[PDB]
Design a binder for this molecule. Structure first.
Ligand SMILES: CCCCCCCCCCCCCCCCCC(=O)OC[C@H](COP(=O)([O-])OCC(O)COP(=O)([O-])OC[C@@H](COC(=O)CCCCCCCCCCCCCCCCC)OC(=O)CCCCCCCCCCCCCCCCC)OC(=O)CCCCCCCCCCCCCCCCC
Ligand SMILES: CCCCCCCCCCCCCCCCCC(=O)OC[C@H](COP(=O)([O-])OCC(O)COP(=O)([O-])OC[C@@H](COC(=O)CCCCCCCCCCCCCCCCC)OC(=O)CCCCCCCCCCCCCCCCC)OC(=O)CCCCCCCCCCCCCCCCC
Ligand SMILES: CCCCCCCCCCCCCCCCCC(=O)OC[C@H](COP(=O)([O-])OCC(O)COP(=O)([O-])OC[C@@H](COC(=O)CCCCCCCCCCCCCCCCC)OC(=O)CCCCCCCCCCCCCCCCC)OC(=O)CCCCCCCCCCCCCCCCC
Ligand SMILES: CCCCCCCCCCCCCCCCCC(=O)OC[C@H](COP(=O)([O-])OCC(O)COP(=O)([O-])OC[C@@H](COC(=O)CCCCCCCCCCCCCCCCC)OC(=O)CCCCCCCCCCCCCCCCC)OC(=O)CCCCCCCCCCCCCCCCC
Ligand SMILES: CCCCCCCCCCCCCCCCC[C@@H](O)O[C@H](CO[C@H](O)CCCCCCCCCCCCCCC)COP(=O)(O)OCC[N+](C)(C)C
Ligand SMILES: CCCCCCCCCCCCCCCCC[C@@H](O)O[C@H](CO[C@H](O)CCCCCCCCCCCCCCC)COP(=O)(O)OCC[N+](C)(C)C
Ligand SMILES: CCCCCCCCCCCCCCCCC[C@@H](O)O[C@H](CO[C@H](O)CCCCCCCCCCCCCCC)COP(=O)(O)OCC[N+](C)(C)C
Ligand SMILES: CCCCCCCC/C=C\CCCCCCCC(=O)O[C@H](COC(=O)CCCCCCC/C=C/CCCCCCCC)COP(=O)(O)OCCN
Lengths: 140, 459, 55, 56, 122, 347, 70, 104, 53
């Protein structure tokens, strides 16, 4: 929901890193839960316990990625004393990518995920700065 | 300029209604006549362009490109009829139709007054090229080459369209004259940075830029001779034309957004020149030489000085002619021995003397021997770069060496040494091939005589 | 090292690999209405909660 | 005997006809942009005693 | 978003209102009409080709009917398109005339009094 | 089946669509949808076999669920305002449910799974009908209630449709499945611009219908339902394969062909509002549809596959049935771009 | 001779360029004005464009209703 | 059959000099080949090349090089006669330029 | 989308049932006849956008 997104975004950038990490963990957990729900729906796991294990795996992976991203991004923002800089989000995104690589235990996944997640997080920070809209309201 | 466009549209039904044994003759004659007519576009002014109507106009940068396209069509017609002898009449007419359609699209591309019509035609040139490569290529790899030719281009050009229409909603026009007269500076923001990248990446991939060039060896090696000729001579120059056009609205961002592209271009001309030294394929060597020369052109355009622009235009024209000649020269040997390996047939100066003369002239022109227009463009670019930064003379100097090496290397391996013993099917050169080489080479020296015609609007 | 391996690895080979894996993911369905009707139910609930609850 | 010659070489007028038609169309397009004929601050002038328009 | 569906006074299925007669008809030498005729001719050629007949000379009455039908439809299509653009311009000009506050004309400035930054290229 | 009965069923399908498109009362729109589905089910089963029966069952289940949701949305809207006229739909929950129902009817992702199955399970004529005529009524209703559409849900489903259409079509060797995934992608393209301009939706629908008709008529002319069966056609009728390649290139969206006109215009409309990122994603994704069109063109027209001996007999015979509208459909599908401004007559 | 036979004077191209420039500038101004007018019409809904249908008042029955208070 | 398919054998390449010792490399028909050679050599070398070079060489001076040279000669003569500076650092007259009022 | 055949032909195929303030049998009034009548008369001819405010 947008309640979680507002919970994350209401806290300023370089302040209260633990709260921001908690909000990012909530977002990641929700995303992993949705992914596991769709995966179980389309690919049944053949027993209840295997489905529970898969759901726990997916949710834990996504929540860890989100928590690491939020913590690293906030700590970088506060240490460098440079809020409104996409580099902090890039560092957090690559930290999340390396977390995903460690979780799946693959070096190629780790490298590609770090690069792409850092780029995407930096892009999102840029859009927050300049007011880019993904879903533009009809205007003309 | 409908006086040039309509005769090609009439080339179409003339080709499709000619007798089965007169298609080549009629096509060649009327293409040559159209080239003669298009030669009248060189009467340019020193202040503004020739605005024929609301849709078409000509500058001093596009007129030599149009003349080059019109002159190139008959050359491909002559070089094509050798290996298409066993083909049926309808397929031969379809081949000539593909060439004519490509010429028509390029002619209308080089003279569109609006950026969106330019975009439409500069994508429309993709279809005949893909059909030619994937249908009349020789080896199995052609299919893959076609794919590499297609998406590499489209992945670059689809963002551009977006930017283009976005610009139309903010400035209210895409007409080039209005765009030039109402130009405004670009602020330092992320939105402007991504607009710059979207406007620039299509023409960067078309040149191609180093790191974005993997499609070029495939496309230029797996294509037929006419396909390779038109790919190297004209289609690579669309990126240069487009970038020299579009850079009018990107200042002063380029002042710092050219740095990664300048670095890529310089180190990549070094890398591709070094790659050319170890190449067992004769066509791949020519492809990588094209890459190096286009890297020089990219540097020239990114510097954004008048001398660099003049050098870029001259190098574009000269490289087109030289690369087309080299491809034809390699294709003669391929048609003889049915192999592209460079060390297979050796000592061909002993067996084919006049073709050895053509090889020597083409190799000398490639390595920028003065006073060829290749050298003029290269030297103008080097001087502008030295004004930009004094250390560039290192890297450019390096290139000026390596080029010559591989150039002579090719010559020495294909013409010199002792002939291969077991090859005994090497027939004397036909009149067609000799005329092809002569018609490639003589305009180069004629342009050397009067080089102001190809120095662009900055002259 | 550069042209034949890594410049190939980054742009075209990675793109083809990702597209092929995604296509395998999307198109490899058993054709059982039970599974994707359960997917329909999940989608309906998610959209009623996400987009509709926020008006 | 000119029938066979005509049927075998009548396609040799298509391109020249296209060229003259293109010249005509260029002139026609030129005819539609005369809003400033003899009106520019640089080329404005008094008409010759016999002529009608400065350019066609 | 439907801009012109609810414009007052629009008859539902007219395709050509009476006000459209206040506009000049397209000339029969319109390049768009000639392009429509060319489309009809190409359709006739493709029809001959698919049926395995001499493509150029098989059916002249059929090709004539193709060209005639395409030109006939194109004439009215062009009429309606021109009318709709005329209506758009009429509404736009009326709205600009009726809301002066939203469309002010500010004082013009010559380039001798506007300070533009200079960015050297070097 | 009796030809008279078939003609009556086709008329009933068309009458239901027209009833949806001319009605002003919500109950009559629902009645039109019901009539259309009722008459459409027998047509899918015209050639009886287990696959046609399975396709009809899946189609019926999906459309019945969608109709249920549509009626519940109408009843909720009536509850919160005593209105029966098709208008702004004064309640947001009702509009969400209406959007989902019309999406499930259209086949937009994630309600997309049924389209490849149903298209593969029926004949080429039934597939032509299903992928061309069945898109009219839901898009008409969506156009009529466009001003109250929630942009986020609509755009999310359109983007999902484009992505899934590309990825799914990448993996297919069956022509009908390729057509189904192409239809999903084009549905996404039509629905993406719907909240901003319905005229662009109508224009995209017209172009897509023309191209789909040409494609299916070419496939019927050369009775091929697989890639390898289509690869034999060059040895029998090369003109059909050539026109097929041109139409496939047009469908891919390449200029100067007419298939480029809708996307182009749609992109412009989105950039008239702010909406920059979404058109970029759509074009980059439509590259995938272009990829598998190009692979089909490779297999069928640009190369020659090995043939069979018995094909010699086929050389002595001509096509008996002839599609009279095929040349006009091909021409409209390829050479119509210079006639772009005529879209002004669409609004 | 070449100039006399094949080419015209500079004033022709000069004034044709002037006419083309005027037409293009007018088109650009019209495009921007149309965008602004569309934005205002969609925001306010007080013009001919973006007029969405409402219920017809001719459908109302102005008769005694078997109860005095409707 | 230990094969995969029925196929024609790969044919040898045809030598155009075998049936026509003077073959010009254009076509296997001697007459059409000879006329192809003639038309190429005439329309390429005689018409486009030489006449095109002659046409380009004598193109009228539309870039205004001699015009600009004469105008510059007049200007230098005038300013040298009056002792004025030969070139002025300001291209636009400052009297027609209005600067911003305050620089502080 | 919407082909207004009723309005073009003056047919009234389904407009008689759309609102609760429209000629009920035996003149039986709706529960909110006055309110719906007033709202319809307020919003008549001014468009949905202006009506909503
Ligand atoms: C206005 C419009 C809105 C309308 C919507 C709202 C309406 C609500 C009305 C509700 C009223 C109830 C009415 C009854 C409906 C009929 C149900 C039915 O017919 O069952 C058919 C169906 C098939 O029957 P069958 O084929 O005869 O028997 C097969 C066996 O059952 C199993 O066969 P098997 O052994 O071969 O397979 C192994 C096993 C494997 O089973 C599993 O793997 C599932 C275990 C997953 C673990 C969940 C994670 C645990 C923590 C999550 C909690 C989230 C909050 C906290 C956050 C995290 C905490 C840290 O089963 C499966 O694979 C089947 C998967 C189906 C699971 C349930 C489907 C719901 C959506 C998918 C959920 C996926 C879970 C991921 C997480 C999502 C969030 C919960 O039966 C079932 O699926 C199981 C019974 C479920 C029904 C009870 C609950 C009803 C739920 C209603 C909605 C809520
Ligand atoms: C356009 C022009 C041309 C450009 C295009 C072409 C050139 C660019 C692209 C080509 C090169 C980039 C490739 C990226 C890495 C590829 C990995 C891969 O494909 O995985 C599949 C492949 C499959 O693995 P698997 O099947 O999953 O498992 C079986 C393993 O093989 C079994 O593995 P194992 O048992 O042998 O042990 C593996 C283990 C241990 O590895 C070993 O066994 C031997 C030790 C080698 C480790 C090397 C690091 C220590 C020395 C480095 C010294 C400093 C670096 C140079 C900077 C100097 C500054 C002046 O590795 C690790 O533990 C990794 C932990 C982290 C250490 C390495 C990370 C260093 C990152 C560099 C940061 C630079 C920041 C910017 C600097 C700015 C100033 C220049 O993974 C590998 O096997 C490779 C393992 C080594 C990966 C790390 C190598 C670092 C290379 C430099 C990266 C920087 C470029 C990217 C930057 C952009 C990102 C934002
Ligand atoms: C400077 C000399 C002044 C002379 C004035 C007249 C020169 C007119 C030349 C016009 C172009 C001729 C056509 C060239 C294509 C070849 C035609 C052919 O197949 O010949 C077979 C024909 C029949 O012999 P064959 O028995 O069949 O023998 C065949 C065997 O394979 C046996 O083959 P081969 O062993 O006889 O091999 C042919 C021979 C000759 O073949 C060629 O090399 C032709 C291409 C020349 C170089 C092209 C690459 C460099 C591009 C530079 C562009 C310069 C353009 C100059 C203006 C051109 C205007 C049309 O190869 C070489 O000698 C090596 C050439 C190395 C050039 C070294 C000098 C570099 C440039 C020097 C500056 C030039 C401007 C000087 C004025 C500057 C200010 C004072 O032999 C001849 O016709 C004689 C060839 C003599 C060529 C002299 C090369 C020097 C002149 C260069 C351009 C002169 C421009 C004239 C205006 C003033 C400048
Ligand atoms: C942009 C500016 C203008 C350009 C507009 C666009 C281009 C032109 C318009 C397009 C449509 C026009 C033609 C459509 C009908 C063609 C159907 C056909 O099969 O042709 C066979 C037919 C020859 O067959 P035949 O004579 O019955 O006997 C031979 C056997 O049938 C032996 O036949 P077969 O079937 O046994 O042979 C098999 C062969 C046969 O397969 C084919 O014939 C392929 C033809 C495909 C038709 C094009 C598709 C629909 C149009 C879309 C074009 C899009 C262009 C945009 C860019 C994309 C590039 C493709 O198939 C293959 O070998 C497979 C090869 C695979 C290659 C892949 C390339 C395919 C696409 C090529 C399309 C290029 C554009 C059209 C070129 C014209 C073609 C005739 O061609 C013709 O002779 C008719 C064409 C010329 C008639 C018009 C002449 C005008 C009247 C003269 C006076 C001019 C007035 C001047 C005014 C002032 C007075 C002085
Ligand atoms: C005299 C010797 C020394 C000098 C030699 C000079 C050589 C120059 C001659 C060569 C011609 C060069 C190319 C000509 C291109 C011109 C194309 C076009 O731009 O010109 C048109 C003019 O058209 C002319 O008719 C050009 C026709 C020339 C075409 C060349 C064909 C020759 C082919 C050779 C065949 C020889 C026999 C073949 C037997 C097989 C302009 O149309 P127009 O609308 O008026 O312009 C208005 C300007 N006005 C007002 C001043 C009139
Ligand atoms: C293989 C070859 C293919 C072609 C490659 C094309 C190359 C494209 C590269 C684009 C060039 C520049 C892009 C962005 C401009 C500046 C980059 C950045 O490093 O500069 C600093 C930016 O600071 C930080 O670096 C923030 C960016 C960090 C995140 C960006 C991701 C970079 C990681 C490398 C990814 C590789 C990209 C290519 C993938 C293939 C400037 O500091 P700042 O003053 O604050 O920003 C100026 C803009 N302002 C004024 C609006 C504020
Ligand atoms: C096989 C035998 C080889 C050896 C034997 C050689 C025999 C001797 C012949 C060689 C002569 C030596 C050359 C010396 C130069 C003299 C010619 C020169 O004077 O003419 C130039 C003139 O030449 C032309 O300017 C250049 C030729 C035109 C080039 C156009 C190419 C033709 C188009 C064909 C297609 C083009 C394809 C490429 C697209 C761009 C002068 O230029 P310019 O300073 O002004 O003249 C001032 C006076 N004007 C202005 C009144 C004329
Ligand atoms: C084969 C490889 C070819 C490479 C080509 C692809 C690279 C293209 C470069 C990026 C293109 C995306 C830009 C889209 C068009 C931008 C036009 C524009 O001006 O929009 C900006 C906005 O710019 C954006 O929105 C762009 C957001 C980014 C979305 C897409 C990101 C694409 C991936 C980024 C990394 C790739 C870039 C470098 C690639 C180098 C080549 C490999 C203005 O928007 P406003 O809303 O009006 O802002 C003012 C009000 N606040």
């Amino acid at each position: 929901a947008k309640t979680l997104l507002h919970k994350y975004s209401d806290i300023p950038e370089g302040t209260e890193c633990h709260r921001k990490a908690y909000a990012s963990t909530s977002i990641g957990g929700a995303t992993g839960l949705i992914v596991s729900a769709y995966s179980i729906a389309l690919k049944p796991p053949a027993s209840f316990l295997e489905g529970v294990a898969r759901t726990g795996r997916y949710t834990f992976t996504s929540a860890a990625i989100g928590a690491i991203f939020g913590l690293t991004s906030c700590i970088s923002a506060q240490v460098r004393e440079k809020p409104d800089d996409p580099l902090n989000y890039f560092i957090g995104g690559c930290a999340g990518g390396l977390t995903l690589g460690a979780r799946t235990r693959s070096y190629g996944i780790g490298a590609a995920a770090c690069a792409y997640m850092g780029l995407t997080a930096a892009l999102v920070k840029m859009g927050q700065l300049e007011g880019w809209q993904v879903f533009a309201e009809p205007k003309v | 300029m409908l006086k040039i466009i309509i005769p090609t549209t009439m080339l179409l039904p003339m080709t499709w209604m000619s007798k089965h044994n007169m298609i080549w003759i009629n096509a060649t004659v009327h293409s040559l006549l159209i080239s003669l007519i298009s030669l009248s576009l060189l009467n340019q002014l020193g202040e503004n362009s020739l605005n024929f109507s609301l849709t078409f106009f000509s500058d001093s940068l596009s007129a030599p490109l149009l003349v080059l396209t019109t002159w190139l069509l008959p050359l491909m017609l002559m070089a094509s009829q050798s290996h298409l002898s066993k083909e049926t009449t309808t397929r031969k007419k379809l081949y000539i139709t593909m060439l004519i359609l490509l010429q028509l699209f390029l002619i209308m591309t080089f003279t569109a007054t609006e950026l969106i019509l330019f975009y439409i035609l500069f994508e429309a040139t993709l279809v005949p090229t893909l059909i030619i490569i994937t249908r009349w290529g020789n080896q199995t790899e052609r299919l893959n080459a076609g794919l590499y030719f297609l998406f590499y281009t489209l992945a670059g050009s689809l963002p551009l369209l977006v930017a283009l229409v976005y610009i139309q909603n903010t400035t209210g026009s895409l007409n080039f004259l209005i765009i030039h007269y109402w130009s405004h500076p670009l602020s330092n923001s992320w939105s402007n940075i991504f607009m710059w990248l979207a406007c620039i990446m299509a023409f960067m991939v078309k040149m191609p830029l180093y790191g974005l060039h993997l499609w070029l060896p495939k496309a230029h090696v797996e294509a037929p001779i006419a396909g390779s000729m038109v790919l190297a001579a004209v289609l690579l120059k669309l990126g240069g034309y487009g970038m020299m056009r579009i850079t009018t609205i990107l200042n002063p961002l380029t002042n710092y957004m050219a740095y990664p592209f300048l670095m890529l271009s310089m180190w990549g001309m070094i890398m591709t020149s070094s790659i050319c030294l170890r190449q067992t394929d004769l066509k791949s060597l020519i492809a990588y030489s094209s890459v190096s020369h286009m890297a020089l052109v990219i540097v020239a355009i990114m510097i954004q000085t008048p001398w660099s622009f003049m050098g870029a235009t001259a190098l574009m024209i000269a490289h087109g002619l030289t690369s087309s000649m080299l491809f034809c020269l390699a294709n003669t040997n391929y048609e003889r021995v049915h192999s592209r390996t460079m060390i297979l047939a050796r000592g061909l100066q002993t067996l084919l003397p006049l073709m050895a003369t053509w090889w020597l002239v083409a190799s000398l022109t490639n390595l920028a021997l003065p006073p060829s227009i290749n050298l003029i463009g290269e030297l103008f670019i080097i001087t502008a770069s030295f004004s930009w930064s004094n250390i560039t003379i290192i890297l450019m100097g390096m290139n000026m060496m390596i080029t010559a090496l591989y150039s002579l290397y090719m010559l020495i391996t294909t013409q010199r040494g002792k002939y291969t013993h077991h090859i005994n099917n090497i027939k004397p050169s036909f009149t067609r091939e000799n005329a092809l080489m002569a018609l490639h080479i003589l305009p180069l020296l004629l342009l050397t005589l009067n080089p102001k015609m190809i120095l662009g609007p900055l002259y | 090292l550069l042209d034949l391996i890594w410049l190939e690895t980054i742009l075209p080979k990675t793109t083809s690999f990702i597209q092929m894996k995604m296509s395998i993911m999307v198109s490899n369905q058993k054709g059982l209405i039970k599974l994707y009707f359960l997917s329909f139910l999940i989608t309906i609930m998610i959209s009623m909660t996400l987009f509709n609850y926020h008006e | 005997n000119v029938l066979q010659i005509v049927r075998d070489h009548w396609v040799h007028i298509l391109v020249p006809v296209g060229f003259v038609f293109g010249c005509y169309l260029d002139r026609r397009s030129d005819e539609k942009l005369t809003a400033f004929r003899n009106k520019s601050l640089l080329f404005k002038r008094e008409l010759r005693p016999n002529e009608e328009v400065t350019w066609k | 978003m439907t801009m012109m569906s609810g414009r007052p006074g629009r008859v539902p299925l007219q395709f050509l209102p009476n006000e459209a007669r206040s506009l000049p008809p397209p000339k029969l030498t319109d390049p768009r009409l000639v392009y429509m005729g060319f489309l009809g001719y190409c359709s006739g050629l493709i029809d001959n080709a698919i049926r395995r007949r001499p493509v150029v000379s098989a059916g002249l009455h059929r090709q004539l009917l193709y060209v005639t039908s395409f030109v006939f439809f194109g004439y009215y299509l062009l009429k309606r398109q021109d009318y709709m653009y005329a209506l758009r311009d009429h509404d736009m000009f009326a709205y600009v005339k009726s809301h002066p506050e939203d469309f002010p004309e500010k004082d013009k400035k010559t380039y001798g009094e506007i300070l533009e930054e200079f960015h050297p290229v070097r | 089946m009796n030809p008279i009965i078939y003609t009556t069923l086709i008329m009933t399908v068309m009458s239901g669509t027209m009833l949806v498109m001319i009605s002003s009362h919500w109950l009559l729109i629902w009645i039109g949808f019901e009539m259309n589905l009722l008459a459409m089910i027998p047509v899918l089963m015209k050639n009886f076999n287990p696959r046609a029966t399975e396709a009809a069952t899946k189609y019926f289940l999906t459309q019945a669920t969608a109709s249920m949701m549509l009626m519940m949305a109408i009843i909720i809207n009536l509850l919160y305002s005593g209105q029966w006229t098709i208008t702004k739909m004064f309640n947001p929950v009702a509009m969400t449910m209406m959007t989902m129902a019309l999406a499930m009817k259209l086949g937009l992702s994630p309600f997309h799974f049924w389209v490849p199955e149903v298209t593969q399970g029926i004949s080429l004529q039934a597939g032509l009908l299903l992928l061309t005529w069945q898109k009219l009524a839901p898009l008409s209703v969506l156009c009529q209630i466009s001003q109250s559409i929630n942009p986020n849900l609509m755009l999310t489903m359109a983007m999902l449709s484009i992505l899934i259409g590309g990825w799914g079509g990448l993996n297919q060797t069956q022509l009908r499945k390729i057509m189904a995934y192409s239809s999903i992608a084009h549905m996404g393209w039509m629905t993406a611009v719907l909240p901003y301009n319905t005229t662009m939706t109508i224009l995209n629908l017209l172009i897509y219908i023309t191209m789909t008709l040409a494609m299916f008529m070419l496939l019927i002319h050369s009775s091929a339902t697989t890639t390898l069966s289509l690869s034999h056609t060059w040895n029998k009728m090369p003109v059909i394969t050539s026109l097929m390649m041109v139409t496939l290139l047009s469908m891919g969206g390449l200029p100067p062909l007419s298939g480029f006109m809708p996307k182009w215009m749609i992109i412009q409309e989105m950039t008239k509002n702010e909406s920059i990122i979404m058109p970029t994603l759509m074009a980059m994704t439509a590259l995938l549809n272009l990829y598998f069109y190009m692979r089909l063109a490779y297999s069928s027209s640009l190369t020659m596959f090995p043939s069979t001996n018995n094909m010699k007999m086929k050389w002595q015979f001509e096509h008996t049935k002839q599609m009279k509208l095929l040349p006009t459909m091909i021409v409209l599908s390829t050479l119509v771009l210079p006639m772009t401004p005529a879209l002004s007559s669409l609004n | 001779w070449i100039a006399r036979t094949f080419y015209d004077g500079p004033e022709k191209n000069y004034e044709k360029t002037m006419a083309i420039l005027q037409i293009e500038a007018e088109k650009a101004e019209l495009r921007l004005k149309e965008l602004e007018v569309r934005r205002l019409m969609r925001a306010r809904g007080d013009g001919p464009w973006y007029q969405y249908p409402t219920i017809d008042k001719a459908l109302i029955d102005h008769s005694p209703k078997t109860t005095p208070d409707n | 059959p230990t094969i995969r398919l029925q196929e024609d054998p790969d044919p040898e390449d045809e030598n155009l000099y075998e049936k026509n010792p003077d073959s010009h490399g254009y076509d296997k028909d001697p007459i059409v080949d000879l006329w192809n050679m003639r038309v190429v050599f005439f329309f390429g070398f005689s018409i486009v090349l030489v006449l095109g070079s002659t046409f380009v060489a004598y193109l009228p001076d539309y870039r205004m090089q001699e015009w600009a040279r004469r105008e510059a000669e007049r200007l230098v003569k005038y300013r040298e006669a009056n002792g004025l500076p030969l070139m002025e650092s300001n291209c636009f007259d400052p009297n027609k330029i209005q600067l911003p009022e305050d620089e502080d | 989308p919407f082909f207004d055949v009723q309005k073009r032909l003056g047919l009234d195929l389904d407009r008689w049932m759309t609102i609760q303030s429209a000629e009920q049998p035996h003149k039986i009034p709706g529960r909110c006849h006055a309110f719906e009548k007033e709202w319809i008369e307020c919003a008549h001819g001014i468009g949905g956008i202006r009506a909503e405010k």
